[PDB]
Amino acid sequence: LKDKEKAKEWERKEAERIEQKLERSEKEALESYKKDSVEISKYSQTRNYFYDYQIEANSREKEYKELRNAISKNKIDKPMYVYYFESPEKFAFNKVIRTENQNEISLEKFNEFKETIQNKLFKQDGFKDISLWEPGKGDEKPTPLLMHLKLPRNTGMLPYTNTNNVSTLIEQGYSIKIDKIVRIVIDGKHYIKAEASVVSSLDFKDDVSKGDSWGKANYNDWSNKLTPNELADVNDYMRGGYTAINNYLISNGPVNNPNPELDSKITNIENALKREPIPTNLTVYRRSGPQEFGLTLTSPEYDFNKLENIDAFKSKWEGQALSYPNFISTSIGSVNMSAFAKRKIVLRITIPKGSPGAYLSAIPGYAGEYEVLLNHGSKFKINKIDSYKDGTITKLIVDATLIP
Ligand SMILES: NC(=O)C1=CN([C@@H]2O[C@H](COP(=O)(O)OP(=O)(O)OC[C@H]3O[C@@H](n4cnc5c(N)ncnc54)[C@H](OP(=O)(O)O)[C@@H]3O)[C@@H](O)[C@H]2O)C=CC1
């Protein structure tokens, strides 16, 4: 736990042991990592949001895949705790816990951080260097926030040597919940120690073929579980009826201009989506237009190239609920597509096991790929908003959870 001498000796011994296992290509990727860790780790966070050809061609993509593979071949046989420092902004606490010159963290700030991270899951992605022991009076402590994360059995972990130093690499690909926070003292300064655990979610990211295999496996027989009316209304919807149905819902037609024929279709589609609930925690992706967030294509606020507009968007939406009156299309894949080339908001949604939903792309012939349809009137809790550059265009990733 705080046993530095033990963990470093073990870590070094393990590094030198694993080094004999690695493929030449993996050793090559590791050599590159030692030289360019910041940019490779950043790449590993957002690589999957670009086009397939951008992914393929990227100067860091082969390095990513090799490092990914190497990490996976050293799986832990029991659960293990790891330590790493984190920015409070990572958990949507968009301010300092204390300045780096200050020693103390006020009770108010401690409690405010607690309230911010409560009852939320946060998606974690990309390579990370971690420590096996609690950083002490002699280590690099770049932030007032120290994560103490329990990694589950069979998590990949790669100890490696870098000059005279030893580090351990993981690839994050899960959500975390912060179960407890405690104010600790290290070398005369207060830190927040956050006790965290992993919650898993099936997340294909750019691997649309595996996602499709899963979707069809789970929804090939979905049509056969529907009544004649349900199947006919789902068909109508997928064949182009979605426009009239969703416009009616968005404009609150059921109240202001009731159409009982449409009401019936909506009821049938909802029952169809409740017929075979999402069988596991699943991550889906939606490329959202401005109107879904109360903006238009010509809103000055939609220009996320200006930092002011990101801060304004976060202030409005982060930690808040978002509800769609219409049925919501999403994809199992995170890749950009020509149809949504310039859309600036990526909704990254965790669907809890048992939620209404269906993999529509399992229906034969249907011209539409990798699609998961969610129920009308769905509510989404926004945990965290991130930004990234897509060429010259700043885009946003909205980490949300589908809630009751
Ligand atoms: N978007 C995605 O990532 C995915 C889309 N699909 C399917 O691909 C096709 C084209 O995609 P898309 O353009 O999204 O078509 P959609 O029918 O999903 O949306 C059409 C327009 O309606 C606007 N809109 C949607 N919901 C709301 C809302 N609640 N409030 C206000 N405005 C809203 C959108 O934003 P705005 O007007 O600001 O641009 C969009 O321009 C559709 O058949 C869709 O079902 C399948 C998988 C994923």
GROMACS .gro file of C-alpha atoms and ligand atoms in nm:
model
  452
    1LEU     CA    1   0.000   0.000   0.000
    2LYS     CA    2   0.259   0.255   0.117
    3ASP     CA    3   0.539  -0.003   0.080
    4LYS     CA    4   0.753   0.169  -0.186
    5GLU     CA    5   1.070  -0.044  -0.165
    6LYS     CA    6   0.874  -0.369  -0.209
    7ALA     CA    7   0.660  -0.251  -0.501
    8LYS     CA    8   0.950  -0.102  -0.701
    9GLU     CA    9   1.165  -0.416  -0.666
   10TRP     CA   10   0.866  -0.632  -0.766
   11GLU     CA   11   0.775  -0.392  -1.051
   12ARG     CA   12   1.133  -0.395  -1.184
   13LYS     CA   13   1.157  -0.775  -1.159
   14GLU     CA   14   0.822  -0.808  -1.336
   15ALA     CA   15   0.923  -0.558  -1.608
   16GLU     CA   16   1.244  -0.751  -1.684
   17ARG     CA   17   1.044  -1.077  -1.688
   18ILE     CA   18   0.773  -0.942  -1.924
   19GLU     CA   19   1.034  -0.789  -2.158
   20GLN     CA   20   1.135  -1.143  -2.262
   21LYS     CA   21   0.771  -1.219  -2.354
   22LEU     CA   22   0.712  -0.918  -2.585
   23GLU     CA   23   0.702  -0.942  -2.964
   24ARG     CA   24   0.957  -0.733  -3.159
   25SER     CA   25   0.672  -0.510  -3.286
   26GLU     CA   26   0.549  -0.463  -2.926
   27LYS     CA   27   0.901  -0.376  -2.802
   28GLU     CA   28   0.914  -0.127  -3.089
   29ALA     CA   29   0.586   0.036  -2.982
   30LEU     CA   30   0.712   0.045  -2.624
   31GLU     CA   31   1.033   0.221  -2.738
   32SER     CA   32   0.816   0.482  -2.914
   33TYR     CA   33   0.599   0.521  -2.604
   34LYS     CA   34   0.905   0.595  -2.385
   35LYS     CA   35   0.983   0.883  -2.622
   36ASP     CA   36   0.634   1.014  -2.705
   37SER     CA   37   0.409   0.902  -2.415
   38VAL     CA   38   0.202   1.221  -2.387
   39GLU     CA   39   0.091   1.226  -2.751
   40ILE     CA   40   0.042   0.850  -2.781
   41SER     CA   41  -0.176   0.845  -2.465
   42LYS     CA   42  -0.377   1.142  -2.595
   43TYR     CA   43  -0.420   0.959  -2.927
   44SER     CA   44  -0.542   0.646  -2.745
   45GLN     CA   45  -0.823   0.855  -2.587
   46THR     CA   46  -0.985   0.995  -2.904
   47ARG     CA   47  -0.854   0.775  -3.191
   48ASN     CA   48  -1.192   0.603  -3.235
   49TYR     CA   49  -1.393   0.922  -3.315
   50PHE     CA   50  -1.236   0.985  -3.655
   51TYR     CA   51  -1.306   0.822  -3.992
   52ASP     CA   52  -1.179   0.467  -4.053
   53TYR     CA   53  -0.925   0.590  -4.312
   54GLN     CA   54  -0.798   0.855  -4.068
   55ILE     CA   55  -0.758   0.580  -3.808
   56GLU     CA   56  -0.574   0.355  -4.050
   57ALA     CA   57  -0.337   0.623  -4.176
   58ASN     CA   58  -0.255   0.790  -3.844
   59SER     CA   59   0.119   0.785  -3.762
   60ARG     CA   60   0.039   0.651  -3.413
   61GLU     CA   61  -0.219   0.380  -3.496
   62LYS     CA   62   0.019   0.085  -3.535
   63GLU     CA   63   0.191   0.189  -3.210
   64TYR     CA   64  -0.151   0.203  -3.040
   65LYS     CA   65  -0.247  -0.150  -3.155
   66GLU     CA   66   0.087  -0.304  -3.049
   67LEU     CA   67   0.086  -0.136  -2.708
   68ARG     CA   68  -0.279  -0.243  -2.668
   69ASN     CA   69  -0.185  -0.606  -2.749
   70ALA     CA   70   0.120  -0.611  -2.518
   71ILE     CA   71  -0.087  -0.483  -2.222
   72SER     CA   72  -0.355  -0.751  -2.281
   73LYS     CA   73  -0.107  -1.042  -2.265
   74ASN     CA   74  -0.021  -0.965  -1.903
   75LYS     CA   75  -0.354  -1.002  -1.721
   76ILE     CA   76  -0.365  -0.988  -1.341
   77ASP     CA   77  -0.488  -1.310  -1.176
   78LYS     CA   78  -0.647  -1.128  -0.880
   79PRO     CA   79  -0.795  -0.777  -0.832
   80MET     CA   80  -0.534  -0.507  -0.765
   81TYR     CA   81  -0.527  -0.148  -0.640
   82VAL     CA   82  -0.342   0.118  -0.839
   83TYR     CA   83  -0.257   0.482  -0.771
   84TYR     CA   84  -0.246   0.777  -1.008
   85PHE     CA   85  -0.299   1.151  -0.987
   86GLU     CA   86  -0.590   1.313  -1.166
   87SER     CA   87  -0.730   1.657  -1.247
   88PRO     CA   88  -1.061   1.741  -1.070
   89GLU     CA   89  -1.183   1.853  -1.416
   90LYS     CA   90  -1.177   1.486  -1.522
   91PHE     CA   91  -1.484   1.443  -1.297
   92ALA     CA   92  -1.651   1.771  -1.403
   93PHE     CA   93  -1.521   1.968  -1.103
   94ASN     CA   94  -1.403   2.254  -1.323
   95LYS     CA   95  -1.200   2.447  -1.063
   96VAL     CA   96  -0.905   2.394  -0.826
   97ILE     CA   97  -0.943   2.189  -0.508
   98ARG     CA   98  -0.659   2.406  -0.372
   99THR     CA   99  -0.371   2.597  -0.533
  100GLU     CA  100  -0.039   2.415  -0.554
  101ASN     CA  101   0.115   2.665  -0.307
  102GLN     CA  102  -0.163   2.608  -0.050
  103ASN     CA  103  -0.128   2.320   0.195
  104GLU     CA  104  -0.488   2.294   0.311
  105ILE     CA  105  -0.813   2.188   0.145
  106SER     CA  106  -1.118   2.346   0.308
  107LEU     CA  107  -1.406   2.132   0.440
  108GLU     CA  108  -1.645   2.316   0.204
  109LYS     CA  109  -1.436   2.233  -0.104
  110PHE     CA  110  -1.399   1.872   0.010
  111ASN     CA  111  -1.779   1.844   0.050
  112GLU     CA  112  -1.843   2.023  -0.282
  113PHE     CA  113  -1.621   1.770  -0.462
  114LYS     CA  114  -1.811   1.488  -0.288
  115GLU     CA  115  -2.145   1.627  -0.410
  116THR     CA  116  -2.011   1.656  -0.769
  117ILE     CA  117  -1.891   1.296  -0.804
  118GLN     CA  118  -2.185   1.138  -0.617
  119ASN     CA  119  -2.404   0.878  -0.788
  120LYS     CA  120  -2.218   0.912  -1.118
  121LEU     CA  121  -2.022   0.677  -1.340
  122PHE     CA  122  -1.738   0.828  -1.545
  123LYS     CA  123  -1.597   0.676  -1.865
  124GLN     CA  124  -1.216   0.630  -1.857
  125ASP     CA  125  -1.015   0.577  -2.178
  126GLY     CA  126  -0.658   0.556  -2.308
  127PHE     CA  127  -0.314   0.452  -2.187
  128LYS     CA  128  -0.218   0.543  -1.832
  129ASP     CA  129   0.101   0.509  -1.628
  130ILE     CA  130   0.009   0.397  -1.276
  131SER     CA  131   0.185   0.333  -0.944
  132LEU     CA  132   0.149   0.026  -0.723
  133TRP     CA  133   0.212   0.214  -0.396
  134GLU     CA  134   0.088   0.539  -0.240
  135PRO     CA  135   0.302   0.834  -0.357
  136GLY     CA  136   0.501   0.976  -0.067
  137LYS     CA  137   0.738   1.252   0.041
  138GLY     CA  138   0.967   1.214  -0.262
  139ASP     CA  139   0.741   1.140  -0.561
  140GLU     CA  140   0.584   1.351  -0.835
  141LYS     CA  141   0.245   1.471  -0.705
  142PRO     CA  142   0.108   1.696  -0.983
  143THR     CA  143  -0.249   1.744  -0.849
  144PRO     CA  144  -0.437   1.754  -0.515
  145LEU     CA  145  -0.643   1.453  -0.633
  146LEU     CA  146  -0.513   1.098  -0.593
  147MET     CA  147  -0.707   0.805  -0.736
  148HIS     CA  148  -0.693   0.471  -0.559
  149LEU     CA  149  -0.857   0.242  -0.813
  150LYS     CA  150  -0.939  -0.127  -0.776
  151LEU     CA  151  -0.873  -0.298  -1.109
  152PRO     CA  152  -1.063  -0.627  -1.152
  153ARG     CA  153  -0.912  -0.970  -1.209
  154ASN     CA  154  -0.787  -1.012  -1.568
  155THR     CA  155  -0.710  -0.644  -1.630
  156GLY     CA  156  -0.404  -0.605  -1.853
  157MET     CA  157  -0.103  -0.446  -1.682
  158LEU     CA  158   0.237  -0.382  -1.841
  159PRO     CA  159   0.537  -0.307  -1.616
  160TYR     CA  160   0.824  -0.170  -1.825
  161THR     CA  161   1.168  -0.014  -1.782
  162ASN     CA  162   1.245   0.341  -1.893
  163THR     CA  163   1.614   0.435  -1.851
  164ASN     CA  164   1.677   0.378  -1.477
  165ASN     CA  165   1.305   0.404  -1.394
  166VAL     CA  166   1.021   0.152  -1.377
  167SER     CA  167   0.659   0.229  -1.464
  168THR     CA  168   0.342   0.028  -1.523
  169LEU     CA  169   0.106   0.084  -1.814
  170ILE     CA  170  -0.266   0.010  -1.831
  171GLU     CA  171  -0.523   0.076  -2.100
  172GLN     CA  172  -0.842   0.219  -1.952
  173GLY     CA  173  -1.161   0.095  -2.116
  174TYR     CA  174  -1.431   0.106  -1.850
  175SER     CA  175  -1.636   0.333  -1.630
  176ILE     CA  176  -1.544   0.417  -1.271
  177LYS     CA  177  -1.749   0.514  -0.969
  178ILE     CA  178  -1.595   0.696  -0.676
  179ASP     CA  179  -1.717   0.502  -0.373
  180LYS     CA  180  -1.545   0.711  -0.106
  181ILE     CA  181  -1.327   1.020  -0.072
  182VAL     CA  182  -1.092   1.098   0.218
  183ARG     CA  183  -0.870   1.398   0.294
  184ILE     CA  184  -0.512   1.272   0.341
  185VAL     CA  185  -0.178   1.435   0.423
  186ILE     CA  186   0.139   1.382   0.220
  187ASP     CA  187   0.452   1.585   0.304
  188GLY     CA  188   0.256   1.857   0.491
  189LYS     CA  189  -0.011   1.910   0.222
  190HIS     CA  190  -0.375   1.800   0.196
  191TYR     CA  191  -0.480   1.573  -0.090
  192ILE     CA  192  -0.814   1.413  -0.173
  193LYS     CA  193  -0.784   1.036  -0.202
  194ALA     CA  194  -1.067   0.894  -0.410
  195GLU     CA  195  -1.147   0.524  -0.360
  196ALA     CA  196  -1.271   0.404  -0.698
  197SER     CA  197  -1.397   0.085  -0.859
  198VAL     CA  198  -1.461  -0.037  -1.212
  199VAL     CA  199  -1.803  -0.081  -1.371
  200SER     CA  200  -1.782  -0.257  -1.708
  201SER     CA  201  -1.970  -0.160  -2.024
  202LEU     CA  202  -1.959  -0.333  -2.362
  203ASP     CA  203  -1.796  -0.067  -2.580
  204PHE     CA  204  -1.702  -0.153  -2.937
  205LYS     CA  205  -1.565   0.194  -3.015
  206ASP     CA  206  -1.437   0.174  -3.376
  207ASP     CA  207  -1.476  -0.206  -3.407
  208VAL     CA  208  -1.814  -0.199  -3.583
  209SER     CA  209  -1.779  -0.555  -3.714
  210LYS     CA  210  -1.758  -0.709  -3.364
  211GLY     CA  211  -2.046  -0.481  -3.258
  212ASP     CA  212  -2.252  -0.601  -3.552
  213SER     CA  213  -2.179  -0.966  -3.466
  214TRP     CA  214  -2.304  -0.898  -3.111
  215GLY     CA  215  -2.609  -0.702  -3.234
  216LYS     CA  216  -2.724  -0.974  -3.474
  217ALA     CA  217  -2.652  -1.246  -3.215
  218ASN     CA  218  -2.886  -1.067  -2.974
  219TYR     CA  219  -3.150  -0.931  -3.217
  220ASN     CA  220  -3.170  -1.169  -3.517
  221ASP     CA  221  -3.486  -1.323  -3.369
  222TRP     CA  222  -3.627  -0.991  -3.240
  223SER     CA  223  -3.878  -0.953  -3.528
  224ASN     CA  224  -4.026  -1.295  -3.441
  225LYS     CA  225  -4.098  -1.183  -3.083
  226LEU     CA  226  -4.321  -0.900  -3.211
  227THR     CA  227  -4.695  -0.912  -3.287
  228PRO     CA  228  -4.818  -0.842  -3.644
  229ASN     CA  229  -4.903  -0.479  -3.550
  230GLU     CA  230  -4.572  -0.416  -3.370
  231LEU     CA  231  -4.367  -0.557  -3.661
  232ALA     CA  232  -4.567  -0.353  -3.914
  233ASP     CA  233  -4.519  -0.029  -3.716
  234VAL     CA  234  -4.148  -0.095  -3.658
  235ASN     CA  235  -4.121  -0.163  -4.035
  236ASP     CA  236  -4.309   0.159  -4.121
  237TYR     CA  237  -4.081   0.351  -3.882
  238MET     CA  238  -3.758   0.211  -4.032
  239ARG     CA  239  -3.885   0.255  -4.389
  240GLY     CA  240  -3.922   0.635  -4.347
  241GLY     CA  241  -4.214   0.685  -4.107
  242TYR     CA  242  -3.971   0.792  -3.834
  243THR     CA  243  -3.976   1.150  -3.962
  244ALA     CA  244  -4.351   1.205  -3.911
  245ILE     CA  245  -4.345   1.014  -3.582
  246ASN     CA  246  -4.047   1.198  -3.432
  247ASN     CA  247  -4.159   1.546  -3.553
  248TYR     CA  248  -4.498   1.481  -3.390
  249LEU     CA  249  -4.326   1.390  -3.061
  250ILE     CA  250  -4.079   1.684  -3.068
  251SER     CA  251  -4.354   1.938  -3.145
  252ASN     CA  252  -4.555   1.781  -2.860
  253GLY     CA  253  -4.836   1.682  -3.096
  254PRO     CA  254  -4.995   1.438  -2.848
  255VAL     CA  255  -5.100   1.751  -2.655
  256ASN     CA  256  -5.135   2.035  -2.910
  257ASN     CA  257  -5.244   1.845  -3.225
  258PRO     CA  258  -5.337   1.484  -3.129
  259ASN     CA  259  -5.299   1.215  -3.393
  260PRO     CA  260  -5.425   0.885  -3.245
  261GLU     CA  261  -5.295   0.685  -3.547
  262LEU     CA  262  -4.943   0.808  -3.471
  263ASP     CA  263  -5.004   0.755  -3.097
  264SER     CA  264  -5.076   0.388  -3.175
  265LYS     CA  265  -4.761   0.347  -3.384
  266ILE     CA  266  -4.559   0.502  -3.101
  267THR     CA  267  -4.710   0.264  -2.844
  268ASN     CA  268  -4.633  -0.039  -3.065
  269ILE     CA  269  -4.273   0.070  -3.129
  270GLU     CA  270  -4.220   0.133  -2.755
  271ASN     CA  271  -4.356  -0.215  -2.673
  272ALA     CA  272  -4.131  -0.363  -2.943
  273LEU     CA  273  -3.829  -0.191  -2.783
  274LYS     CA  274  -3.932  -0.324  -2.441
  275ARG     CA  275  -3.971  -0.678  -2.584
  276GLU     CA  276  -3.604  -0.781  -2.564
  277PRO     CA  277  -3.423  -0.538  -2.329
  278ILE     CA  278  -3.054  -0.454  -2.381
  279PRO     CA  279  -2.896  -0.770  -2.230
  280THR     CA  280  -2.585  -0.603  -2.081
  281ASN     CA  281  -2.436  -0.259  -2.001
  282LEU     CA  282  -2.378  -0.113  -2.349
  283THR     CA  283  -2.207   0.200  -2.481
  284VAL     CA  284  -2.359   0.363  -2.787
  285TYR     CA  285  -2.270   0.674  -2.986
  286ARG     CA  286  -2.481   0.946  -3.143
  287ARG     CA  287  -2.359   1.229  -3.365
  288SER     CA  288  -2.590   1.508  -3.247
  289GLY     CA  289  -2.698   1.819  -3.436
  290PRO     CA  290  -2.712   2.159  -3.258
  291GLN     CA  291  -3.095   2.156  -3.212
  292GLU     CA  292  -3.076   1.861  -2.971
  293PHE     CA  293  -2.903   2.102  -2.731
  294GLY     CA  294  -3.113   2.415  -2.802
  295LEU     CA  295  -2.873   2.557  -3.060
  296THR     CA  296  -2.872   2.607  -3.437
  297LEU     CA  297  -2.603   2.572  -3.706
  298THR     CA  298  -2.556   2.951  -3.696
  299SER     CA  299  -2.551   2.996  -3.316
  300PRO     CA  300  -2.235   3.185  -3.211
  301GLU     CA  301  -2.239   2.954  -2.906
  302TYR     CA  302  -2.206   2.646  -3.134
  303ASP     CA  303  -1.851   2.759  -3.220
  304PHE     CA  304  -1.651   2.536  -2.985
  305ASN     CA  305  -1.326   2.669  -3.137
  306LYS     CA  306  -1.372   2.949  -2.881
  307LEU     CA  307  -1.301   2.826  -2.527
  308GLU     CA  308  -1.572   3.059  -2.388
  309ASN     CA  309  -1.836   2.854  -2.573
  310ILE     CA  310  -1.716   2.519  -2.432
  311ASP     CA  311  -1.722   2.662  -2.078
  312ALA     CA  312  -2.074   2.797  -2.145
  313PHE     CA  313  -2.189   2.460  -2.285
  314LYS     CA  314  -2.043   2.274  -1.985
  315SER     CA  315  -2.201   2.517  -1.738
  316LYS     CA  316  -2.542   2.460  -1.900
  317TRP     CA  317  -2.522   2.083  -1.952
  318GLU     CA  318  -2.257   1.909  -1.736
  319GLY     CA  319  -2.419   1.725  -1.443
  320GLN     CA  320  -2.765   1.800  -1.589
  321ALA     CA  321  -3.038   1.584  -1.747
  322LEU     CA  322  -3.119   1.571  -2.117
  323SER     CA  323  -3.448   1.428  -2.243
  324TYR     CA  324  -3.558   1.340  -2.595
  325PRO     CA  325  -3.933   1.337  -2.672
  326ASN     CA  326  -3.857   1.145  -2.995
  327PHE     CA  327  -3.719   0.792  -3.045
  328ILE     CA  328  -3.338   0.817  -3.045
  329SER     CA  329  -3.109   0.651  -3.299
  330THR     CA  330  -2.757   0.562  -3.185
  331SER     CA  331  -2.473   0.344  -3.318
  332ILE     CA  332  -2.262   0.071  -3.154
  333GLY     CA  333  -1.968   0.237  -3.335
  334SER     CA  334  -1.791   0.563  -3.247
  335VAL     CA  335  -1.646   0.633  -3.595
  336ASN     CA  336  -1.729   0.953  -3.785
  337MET     CA  337  -1.943   0.912  -4.098
  338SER     CA  338  -1.994   1.124  -4.411
  339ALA     CA  339  -2.361   1.187  -4.319
  340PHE     CA  340  -2.252   1.356  -3.991
  341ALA     CA  341  -1.917   1.496  -4.106
  342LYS     CA  342  -1.949   1.841  -3.950
  343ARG     CA  343  -2.169   1.762  -3.646
  344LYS     CA  344  -1.978   1.883  -3.343
  345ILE     CA  345  -2.140   1.692  -3.056
  346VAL     CA  346  -2.082   1.322  -2.992
  347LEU     CA  347  -2.322   1.171  -2.738
  348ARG     CA  348  -2.149   0.877  -2.570
  349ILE     CA  349  -2.424   0.694  -2.381
  350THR     CA  350  -2.413   0.413  -2.125
  351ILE     CA  351  -2.726   0.196  -2.150
  352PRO     CA  352  -2.784  -0.005  -1.831
  353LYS     CA  353  -2.860  -0.377  -1.863
  354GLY     CA  354  -3.237  -0.423  -1.898
  355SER     CA  355  -3.309  -0.090  -2.070
  356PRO     CA  356  -3.558  -0.073  -2.358
  357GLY     CA  357  -3.379  -0.088  -2.694
  358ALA     CA  358  -3.309  -0.291  -3.006
  359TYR     CA  359  -3.035  -0.348  -3.261
  360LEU     CA  360  -3.241  -0.250  -3.568
  361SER     CA  361  -2.960  -0.334  -3.811
  362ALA     CA  362  -3.026  -0.704  -3.740
  363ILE     CA  363  -3.337  -0.686  -3.960
  364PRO     CA  364  -3.244  -0.826  -4.306
  365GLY     CA  365  -3.200  -0.584  -4.596
  366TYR     CA  366  -3.271  -0.276  -4.383
  367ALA     CA  367  -3.057   0.004  -4.525
  368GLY     CA  368  -2.899   0.135  -4.204
  369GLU     CA  369  -2.587   0.022  -4.023
  370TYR     CA  370  -2.495  -0.054  -3.661
  371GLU     CA  371  -2.809   0.110  -3.524
  372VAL     CA  372  -2.951   0.077  -3.173
  373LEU     CA  373  -3.291   0.245  -3.130
  374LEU     CA  374  -3.378   0.388  -2.787
  375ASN     CA  375  -3.729   0.454  -2.653
  376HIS     CA  376  -3.908   0.788  -2.695
  377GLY     CA  377  -3.897   1.007  -2.385
  378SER     CA  378  -3.554   0.876  -2.277
  379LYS     CA  379  -3.364   1.076  -2.015
  380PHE     CA  380  -2.982   1.106  -2.005
  381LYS     CA  381  -2.766   1.224  -1.714
  382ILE     CA  382  -2.458   1.410  -1.840
  383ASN     CA  383  -2.159   1.310  -1.626
  384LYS     CA  384  -1.874   1.481  -1.806
  385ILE     CA  385  -1.803   1.678  -2.124
  386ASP     CA  386  -1.473   1.663  -2.315
  387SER     CA  387  -1.347   1.844  -2.624
  388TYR     CA  388  -1.119   1.733  -2.906
  389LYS     CA  389  -0.982   1.864  -3.235
  390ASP     CA  390  -1.115   1.710  -3.553
  391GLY     CA  391  -0.869   1.873  -3.792
  392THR     CA  392  -0.934   2.242  -3.731
  393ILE     CA  393  -1.280   2.188  -3.579
  394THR     CA  394  -1.328   2.151  -3.203
  395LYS     CA  395  -1.589   1.886  -3.127
  396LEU     CA  396  -1.738   1.766  -2.797
  397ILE     CA  397  -1.779   1.425  -2.638
  398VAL     CA  398  -2.070   1.408  -2.396
  399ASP     CA  399  -2.037   1.124  -2.140
  400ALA     CA  400  -2.398   1.044  -2.049
  401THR     CA  401  -2.594   0.769  -1.870
  402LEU     CA  402  -2.945   0.658  -1.969
  403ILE     CA  403  -3.161   0.682  -1.655
  404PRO     CA  404  -3.519   0.598  -1.543
  405LIG     N1  405  -2.709   1.060  -3.554
  405LIG     C1  406  -2.647   0.943  -3.537
  405LIG     O1  407  -2.537   0.932  -3.481
  405LIG     C2  408  -2.717   0.820  -3.596
  405LIG     C3  409  -2.818   0.835  -3.691
  405LIG     N2  410  -2.883   0.722  -3.745
  405LIG     C4  411  -2.990   0.739  -3.848
  405LIG     O2  412  -2.924   0.801  -3.963
  405LIG     C5  413  -3.019   0.890  -4.030
  405LIG     C6  414  -2.965   1.036  -4.035
  405LIG     O3  415  -2.919   1.082  -3.905
  405LIG     P1  416  -2.976   1.218  -3.836
  405LIG     O4  417  -2.942   1.332  -3.923
  405LIG     O5  418  -2.937   1.219  -3.694
  405LIG     O6  419  -3.137   1.199  -3.848
  405LIG     P2  420  -3.239   1.206  -3.723
  405LIG     O7  421  -3.375   1.172  -3.773
  405LIG     O8  422  -3.182   1.131  -3.610
  405LIG     O9  423  -3.241   1.364  -3.687
  405LIG     C7  424  -3.284   1.461  -3.784
  405LIG     C8  425  -3.275   1.604  -3.728
  405LIG    O10  426  -3.357   1.615  -3.610
  405LIG     C9  427  -3.286   1.693  -3.512
  405LIG     N3  428  -3.331   1.643  -3.379
  405LIG    C10  429  -3.329   1.516  -3.337
  405LIG     N4  430  -3.377   1.508  -3.213
  405LIG    C11  431  -3.411   1.631  -3.175
  405LIG    C12  432  -3.465   1.684  -3.058
  405LIG     N5  433  -3.494   1.607  -2.954
  405LIG     N6  434  -3.487   1.817  -3.052
  405LIG    C13  435  -3.458   1.896  -3.154
  405LIG     N7  436  -3.407   1.848  -3.266
  405LIG    C14  437  -3.382   1.717  -3.280
  405LIG    C15  438  -3.137   1.663  -3.536
  405LIG    O11  439  -3.051   1.773  -3.496
  405LIG     P3  440  -3.031   1.915  -3.580
  405LIG    O12  441  -3.155   1.966  -3.643
  405LIG    O13  442  -2.965   2.021  -3.481
  405LIG    O14  443  -2.913   1.886  -3.689
  405LIG    C16  444  -3.129   1.627  -3.686
  405LIG    O15  445  -3.077   1.734  -3.765
  405LIG    C17  446  -3.150   0.881  -3.951
  405LIG    O16  447  -3.234   0.783  -4.011
  405LIG    C18  448  -3.105   0.833  -3.814
  405LIG    O17  449  -3.212   0.762  -3.752
  405LIG    C19  450  -2.843   0.593  -3.704
  405LIG    C20  451  -2.742   0.579  -3.609
  405LIG    C21  452  -2.679   0.691  -3.555
   0.00000   0.00000   0.00000
